[PDB]
Design an enzyme around this catalytic site. Structure first.
Site, PDB file in Angstrom:
ATOM      1  CB  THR A  16      -0.971   3.435 -21.699  1.00  0.00           C
ATOM      2  OG1 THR A  16      -0.405   3.256 -23.020  1.00  0.00           O
ATOM      3  CG2 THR A  16      -2.450   3.032 -21.737  1.00  0.00           C
ATOM      4  CG  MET A  17       0.168   9.278 -23.380  1.00  0.00           C
ATOM      5  SD  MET A  17      -1.187  10.498 -23.255  1.00  0.00           S
ATOM      6  CE  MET A  17      -0.502  11.615 -22.013  1.00  0.00           C
ATOM      7  CG  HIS A  52       4.104  10.662 -24.676  1.00  0.00           C
ATOM      8  ND1 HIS A  52       3.468  11.883 -24.740  1.00  0.00           N
ATOM      9  CD2 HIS A  52       3.365   9.809 -25.432  1.00  0.00           C
ATOM     10  CE1 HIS A  52       2.394  11.767 -25.506  1.00  0.00           C
ATOM     11  NE2 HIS A  52       2.311  10.523 -25.942  1.00  0.00           N
ATOM     12  CE1 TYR A 111      11.982   8.278 -31.424  1.00  0.00           C
ATOM     13  CE2 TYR A 111      13.611   8.715 -33.100  1.00  0.00           C
ATOM     14  CZ  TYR A 111      13.050   9.021 -31.886  1.00  0.00           C
ATOM     15  OH  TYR A 111      13.560  10.090 -31.169  1.00  0.00           O
TER      16      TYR A 111
HETATM   17  N1  LIG Z   1      17.336  10.612 -25.823  1.00  0.00           N
HETATM   18  C1  LIG Z   1      17.658  11.006 -27.058  1.00  0.00           C
HETATM   19  O1  LIG Z   1      18.925  10.841 -27.584  1.00  0.00           O
HETATM   20  C2  LIG Z   1      16.656  11.636 -27.948  1.00  0.00           C
HETATM   21  C3  LIG Z   1      17.057  12.042 -29.220  1.00  0.00           C
HETATM   22  C4  LIG Z   1      16.156  12.664 -30.040  1.00  0.00           C
HETATM   23  C5  LIG Z   1      14.867  12.861 -29.576  1.00  0.00           C
HETATM   24  N2  LIG Z   1      14.498  12.468 -28.331  1.00  0.00           N
HETATM   25  C6  LIG Z   1      13.108  12.689 -27.907  1.00  0.00           C
HETATM   26  O2  LIG Z   1      13.012  13.181 -26.574  1.00  0.00           O
HETATM   27  C7  LIG Z   1      11.846  12.625 -25.975  1.00  0.00           C
HETATM   28  C8  LIG Z   1      12.153  11.985 -24.632  1.00  0.00           C
HETATM   29  O3  LIG Z   1      13.224  11.077 -24.765  1.00  0.00           O
HETATM   30  P1  LIG Z   1      13.931  10.453 -23.471  1.00  0.00           P
HETATM   31  O4  LIG Z   1      15.247   9.883 -23.768  1.00  0.00           O
HETATM   32  O5  LIG Z   1      13.806  11.444 -22.382  1.00  0.00           O
HETATM   33  O6  LIG Z   1      12.943   9.255 -23.225  1.00  0.00           O
HETATM   34  P2  LIG Z   1      12.867   8.313 -21.943  1.00  0.00           P
HETATM   35  O7  LIG Z   1      13.879   8.743 -20.959  1.00  0.00           O
HETATM   36  O8  LIG Z   1      13.007   6.883 -22.346  1.00  0.00           O
HETATM   37  O9  LIG Z   1      11.359   8.690 -21.482  1.00  0.00           O
HETATM   38  C9  LIG Z   1      10.204   8.198 -22.125  1.00  0.00           C
HETATM   39  C10 LIG Z   1       9.063   8.741 -21.291  1.00  0.00           C
HETATM   40  O10 LIG Z   1       7.780   8.531 -21.860  1.00  0.00           O
HETATM   41  C11 LIG Z   1       7.051   7.631 -21.028  1.00  0.00           C
HETATM   42  N3  LIG Z   1       6.271   6.636 -21.771  1.00  0.00           N
HETATM   43  C12 LIG Z   1       6.696   5.486 -22.371  1.00  0.00           C
HETATM   44  N4  LIG Z   1       5.624   4.863 -22.927  1.00  0.00           N
HETATM   45  C13 LIG Z   1       4.522   5.598 -22.664  1.00  0.00           C
HETATM   46  C14 LIG Z   1       3.185   5.428 -22.950  1.00  0.00           C
HETATM   47  N5  LIG Z   1       2.774   4.370 -23.623  1.00  0.00           N
HETATM   48  N6  LIG Z   1       2.272   6.365 -22.531  1.00  0.00           N
HETATM   49  C15 LIG Z   1       2.670   7.471 -21.819  1.00  0.00           C
HETATM   50  N7  LIG Z   1       4.015   7.637 -21.544  1.00  0.00           N
HETATM   51  C16 LIG Z   1       4.916   6.715 -21.944  1.00  0.00           C
HETATM   52  C17 LIG Z   1       8.038   6.938 -20.084  1.00  0.00           C
HETATM   53  O11 LIG Z   1       7.538   6.592 -18.808  1.00  0.00           O
HETATM   54  P3  LIG Z   1       6.704   5.251 -18.509  1.00  0.00           P
HETATM   55  O12 LIG Z   1       7.271   4.002 -19.109  1.00  0.00           O
HETATM   56  O13 LIG Z   1       6.555   5.108 -16.996  1.00  0.00           O
HETATM   57  O14 LIG Z   1       5.339   5.318 -19.144  1.00  0.00           O
HETATM   58  C18 LIG Z   1       9.046   8.051 -19.940  1.00  0.00           C
HETATM   59  O15 LIG Z   1       8.586   8.974 -18.975  1.00  0.00           O
HETATM   60  C19 LIG Z   1      11.241  11.643 -26.972  1.00  0.00           C
HETATM   61  O16 LIG Z   1      10.141  12.264 -27.620  1.00  0.00           O
HETATM   62  C20 LIG Z   1      12.352  11.375 -27.955  1.00  0.00           C
HETATM   63  O17 LIG Z   1      11.882  11.032 -29.243  1.00  0.00           O
HETATM   64  C21 LIG Z   1      15.362  11.850 -27.507  1.00  0.00           C
HETATM   65  C1  LIG Z   2      21.575   5.136 -35.794  1.00  0.00           C
HETATM   66  C2  LIG Z   2      20.408   6.099 -35.653  1.00  0.00           C
HETATM   67  C3  LIG Z   2      20.053   6.393 -34.208  1.00  0.00           C
HETATM   68  S1  LIG Z   2      18.599   7.409 -34.119  1.00  0.00           S
HETATM   69  C4  LIG Z   2      19.310   8.993 -33.835  1.00  0.00           C
HETATM   70  N1  LIG Z   2      20.412   9.329 -34.530  1.00  0.00           N
HETATM   71  C5  LIG Z   2      21.022  10.511 -34.334  1.00  0.00           C
HETATM   72  N2  LIG Z   2      22.180  10.824 -35.067  1.00  0.00           N
HETATM   73  C6  LIG Z   2      22.933   9.603 -35.356  1.00  0.00           C
HETATM   74  C7  LIG Z   2      24.071   9.928 -36.338  1.00  0.00           C
HETATM   75  N3  LIG Z   2      24.911  11.061 -35.839  1.00  0.00           N
HETATM   76  C8  LIG Z   2      25.786  11.545 -36.947  1.00  0.00           C
HETATM   77  C9  LIG Z   2      24.060  12.192 -35.351  1.00  0.00           C
HETATM   78  C10 LIG Z   2      23.055  11.705 -34.296  1.00  0.00           C
HETATM   79  C11 LIG Z   2      20.469  11.440 -33.430  1.00  0.00           C
HETATM   80  C12 LIG Z   2      19.314  11.123 -32.717  1.00  0.00           C
HETATM   81  C13 LIG Z   2      18.676   9.910 -32.948  1.00  0.00           C
HETATM   82  C14 LIG Z   2      17.523   9.508 -32.023  1.00  0.00           C
HETATM   83  O1  LIG Z   2      16.453  10.134 -32.036  1.00  0.00           O
HETATM   84  N4  LIG Z   2      17.727   8.470 -31.198  1.00  0.00           N
HETATM   85  C15 LIG Z   2      16.712   8.006 -30.258  1.00  0.00           C
HETATM   86  C16 LIG Z   2      15.794   6.918 -30.803  1.00  0.00           C
HETATM   87  C17 LIG Z   2      16.550   5.586 -31.007  1.00  0.00           C
HETATM   88  C18 LIG Z   2      17.192   5.128 -29.690  1.00  0.00           C
HETATM   89  C19 LIG Z   2      18.149   6.215 -29.223  1.00  0.00           C
HETATM   90  C20 LIG Z   2      17.389   7.531 -28.985  1.00  0.00           C
HETATM   91  C21 LIG Z   2      16.342   7.320 -27.943  1.00  0.00           C
HETATM   92  C22 LIG Z   2      15.361   6.267 -28.417  1.00  0.00           C
HETATM   93  O2  LIG Z   2      14.355   6.107 -27.428  1.00  0.00           O
HETATM   94  C23 LIG Z   2      16.102   4.952 -28.632  1.00  0.00           C
HETATM   95  C24 LIG Z   2      14.708   6.704 -29.753  1.00  0.00           C
END
Ligand SMILES: NC(=O)c1ccc[n+]([C@@H]2O[C@H](COP(=O)([O-])OP(=O)(O)OC[C@H]3O[C@@H](n4cnc5c(N)ncnc54)[C@H](OP(=O)(O)O)[C@@H]3O)[C@@H](O)[C@H]2O)c1
Ligand SMILES: CCCSc1nc(N2CCN(C)CC2)ccc1C(=O)N[C@@H]1[C@@H]2C[C@@H]3C[C@H]1C[C@@](O)(C3)C2
Ligand SMILES: NC(=O)c1ccc[n+]([C@@H]2O[C@H](COP(=O)([O-])OP(=O)(O)OC[C@H]3O[C@@H](n4cnc5c(N)ncnc54)[C@H](OP(=O)(O)O)[C@@H]3O)[C@@H](O)[C@H]2O)c1
Ligand SMILES: CCCSc1nc(N2CCN(C)CC2)ccc1C(=O)N[C@@H]1[C@@H]2C[C@@H]3C[C@H]1C[C@@](O)(C3)C2
Ligand SMILES: [Cl-]
Lengths: 266, 258
Positions: A67-68, A95, A158
């Site tokens: 865990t981080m 992560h 976040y």
């Molecule tokens: N998905 C999106 O639409 C989106 C949008 C914007 C930005 N991002 C960014 O992209 C990155 C990855 O997103 P994702 O959707 O791929 O996330 P995800 O699928 O939910 O993956 C989260 C990862 O981090 C690990 N994690 C969770 N808690 C942890 C902890 N306490 N210590 C170490 N590792 C931990 C999880 O595995 P374990 O639970 O096994 O630890 C998992 O491998 C994030 O930084 C996120 O902010 C994602």
């Molecule tokens: C309502 C806000 C959601 S957060 C978010 N919004 C975005 N905008 C929303 C409005 N659109 C016009 C452009 C895309 C883009 C990216 C993010 C975004 O980073 N979403 C992530 C956040 C919130 C939840 C969904 C994602 C994965 C996560 O683990 C759970 C962490």
């Protein structure tokens, strides 16, 4: 400009690699013959990832689970990973703590846990990694969000954590430049990506076109390899256009022209 | 638009009010006849500040000394400031931990401490103060910097904390807009000011262009009085022109107007 050969035999850490974009980045890197050490809390899932890596053609592939929230674990993980690869060319900080869309009421626990896992541990990871990266002229890739550049409801904690990364890592990038540390820092600003967590978190309220995680992973990897300052990735081209902050760049540059130790000198 | 009379008999907290910009906000608020409660660590200094406030004509003036490294002090302080005044109309969050201009190296502790004092305490203070502010339809003023909008060397921890302020508070501002919570949020983006901390920390060669702290303090108050989302203040009007980010407004409203 980019060639997948660039990652052949390279030494790479991926955090958050049990699922989502992290798992995809591990897989793309394996396909290019990298050495890769992946991390996350589920050892059981990490084992599966490590196997399909080997299968894909990774020069090698290992995991370390933890865990981080544990800064000591953060430090030790980097050392253990460096020993396993005999060095380090790239650090992919990816992560986060699990979150979901809610209005903010009183959850100081969640704001603090977010700041610890999402921000502070990226710093502790970087400090552990830097000696290895300085010797290899390595690269740091920091995965972030639209929501770490612009303001949206339902994600306060976040977003504070993601804004935190921009300010910290963009600032130390200026420092590396004036003090001649040849490590690159790449900040990645992503929109909705179609990971399973994201799609679950969002299925209640406005989805728009999530973008594909496979191409996302590869764009992140291209950015870091090419040593770009920022990577943008979103399914809409309007959003892409509007993310750049040109005038921020002008401000930062006017300062740098006026005050860097190396004002004259090229 | 702005009139001094707007603050007359209003209930206002001012943190980091022992020196610099906050001290000056205490005084300006005093000249306007506000009730003010001030805070910081330096009890002897805060006492003299409070005295000068009554002298300048404050409805009332008191202090409560303490450190904002302690989240439980932060909570208790707002509850006490509230009882003293009967309520709260405006919360001016302005304090910061000590920082010097240095290259970052290893000091995780400094990064953590900056995050707690400069950012987490502000969040703890908002939660404690939100009920009073809800029933007064008041205002929250968050003081930040150019280095909370743009990246500069030598202030990595500090910029993390200020950027964090922007992300948290601009996010909850959107939340109050949707859930019709009638409290305003003002983020102040400041250039170099002639406060004694800044003049100690910054070299002689940049001292030239530090803005006056008196005018800086009145602008902060004005912005929050008028419920402006942001307030920019810098001795160069050129820097002000460049600080606005229309692209971000658009992306925000492209979502919001759905
Ligand atoms: N998905 C999106 O639409 C989106 C949008 C914007 C930005 N991002 C960014 O992209 C990155 C990855 O997103 P994702 O959707 O791929 O996330 P995800 O699928 O939910 O993956 C989260 C990862 O981090 C690990 N994690 C969770 N808690 C942890 C902890 N306490 N210590 C170490 N590792 C931990 C999880 O595995 P374990 O639970 O096994 O630890 C998992 O491998 C994030 O930084 C996120 O902010 C994602
Ligand atoms: C309502 C806000 C959601 S957060 C978010 N919004 C975005 N905008 C929303 C409005 N659109 C016009 C452009 C895309 C883009 C990216 C993010 C975004 O980073 N979403 C992530 C956040 C919130 C939840 C969904 C994602 C994965 C996560 O683990 C759970 C962490
Ligand atoms: N001056 C500039 O060039 C400049 C530029 C951009 C932004 N700003 C912003 O303006 C605001 C104030 O700046 P300034 O120059 O006026 O600062 P300052 O003169 O040093 O005053 C800082 C105030 O914060 C208080 N403080 C320090 N540590 C504290 C702690 N642990 N707990 C509670 N209070 C604490 C100090 O009081 P005690 O020591 O008694 O506790 C003091 O009253 C800050 O938010 C800063 O980021 C200033
Ligand atoms: C080297 C960067 C210092 S941080 C900073 N930079 C700014 N740039 C400088 C260049 N100008 C052309 C535009 C404004 C403006 C404001 C800041 C700024 O926020 N300065 C404050 C920081 C650093 C020291 C002075 C202030 C008080 C403090 O306690 C000590 C904390
Ligand atoms: Cl997934």
């Amino acid at each position: 400009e980019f060639r997948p050969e660039m990652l052949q035999g390279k030494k790479v850490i991926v955090t958050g690699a049990s699922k989502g974009i992290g798992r995809e980045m591990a897989y793309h890197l394996a396909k290019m013959g990298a050495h890769v050490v992946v991390t996350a809390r589920s050892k059981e899932t990490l084992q599966k990832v490590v196997s399909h890596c080997l299968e894909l053609g990774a020069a090698s592939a290992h995991y370390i689970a933890g865990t981080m929230e544990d800064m000591t674990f953060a430090e030790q993980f980097v050392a253990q990973a460096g020993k396993l690869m005999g060095g380090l060319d790239m650090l992919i900080l990816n992560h986060i703590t699990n979150t979901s869309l809610n209005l903010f009421h009183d959850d100081i626990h969640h704001v603090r846990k977010s700041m610890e896992v999402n921000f502070l541990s990226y710093v502790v990871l970087t400090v552990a990694a830097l000696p290895m990266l300085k010797q290899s002229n390595g690269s740091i890739v920091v995965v972030s969000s639209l929501a770490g550049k612009v303001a949206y409801p339902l994600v306060a904690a976040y977003s504070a954590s993601k804004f935190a990364l921009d300010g910290f890592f963009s600032s130390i990038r200026k420092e590396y430049s004036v003090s001649r540390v040849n490590v690159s820092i790449t900040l990645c600003v992503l929109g909705l990506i179609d990971t399973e967590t994201a799609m679950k978190a969002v299925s209640g309220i406005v989805h728009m076109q999530a973008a594909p995680k496979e191409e996302c992973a590869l764009e992140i990897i291209k950015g870091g390899a090419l040593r770009q300052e920022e990577v943008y990735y979103d399914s809409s081209r309007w959003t892409t256009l509007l993310i750049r902050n040109p005038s921020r760049k002008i401000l930062e540059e006017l300062y740098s022209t006026s005050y860097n130790w190396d004002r004259f000198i090229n």
